[PDB]
């Protein structure tokens, strides 16, 4: 029943690619990206949400360390606990750790729950991407080839299932006989294909893409 390919950009559910700079905030970008799609699905409005709000506010209580890393799932829980997250416009990204400056007057989204998908199951990830929306994932992005990706479907024999980088699966498909996951990164539009990378799909949980998937709901 699932479509052979999905691209949530086609449905206007994906915001512009962001640039995290020298702050290890990929986790926060991944989390807001997933929530941005849900916000569009629920309200019809596409709005960039504040990764900085997560960096500054979803901190020790959530096991997160701001520019030194965090979890997408615990970011979602912060949004639930906090009863909101501010817009990116209201609480802009500065690529540094700041005091928490959340203000409900700038709230642009809420979250009521999140779901973690079973480990390594690319079929379940496919179903979620098709039926729920973009899914936050971790990948192994440590390998020099990752940084140099320009086009095609990324396959790195040295990749592992030990994830170190938080990104957003916004689709899937097949290109020239290679199944892929369409991944939104947060290293700006210079990276890959305008900020995206197509990563090998159904190749044994390549780079751990299906290791730790999660998605929020509004
Ligand atoms: C040590 C710096 C990590 C930066 C960085 C990034 C890709 O920007 N990063 C990796 C992570 C990952 C691997 N999480 C963690 O590394 C992490 C770190 C501290 C506390 C909690 C978690 C997530 C993707 C799960 N979070 N941020």
For the biggest sheet, the summary is: 5 strands, antiparallel
CATH topology: Cathepsin B, Chain A
Radius of gyration, in Å, reads 16 Å
Name of the level-1 CATH class: Alpha Beta
Shape: globular
Provide the CATH architecture.
Alpha-Beta Complex
Number of helices: 5
What structural category characterises the helix and strand content? alpha+beta
Per CATH, the superfamily is Cysteine proteinases
Distinct ligand kinds: the ligand C/C=C/C[C@H](C(C)=O)n1cc([C@@](C)(NC(=O)c2ccccc2)C(C)C)nn1
Portion of residues in beta strands equals 15-25%
- Summarize the helix and strand pattern as letters: EHHHEEEHEHEEEE
EC number: 3.4.22.27
Keywords: Cytoplasmic vesicle, Disulfide bond, Glycoprotein, Hydrolase, Lysosome, Protease, Secreted, Signal, Thiol protease, Zymogen
Main location: other
Subcellular location: Lysosome; Secreted; Cytoplasmic vesicle, Phagosome
Report on this model:
- The structure is a monomer.
- The protein is of the alpha+beta class and 218 residues long.
- The protein has one domain: Cysteine proteinases (Cathepsin B, Chain A).
- The strands form 3 sheets. Strands 1, 5, 6, 7 and 8 form a 5-stranded antiparallel β-sheet that branches.
- β6 and β7 form a beta hairpin.
- The longest helix has 18 residues.
- The site of ligand H7J has 16 residues, from α1 and β6.
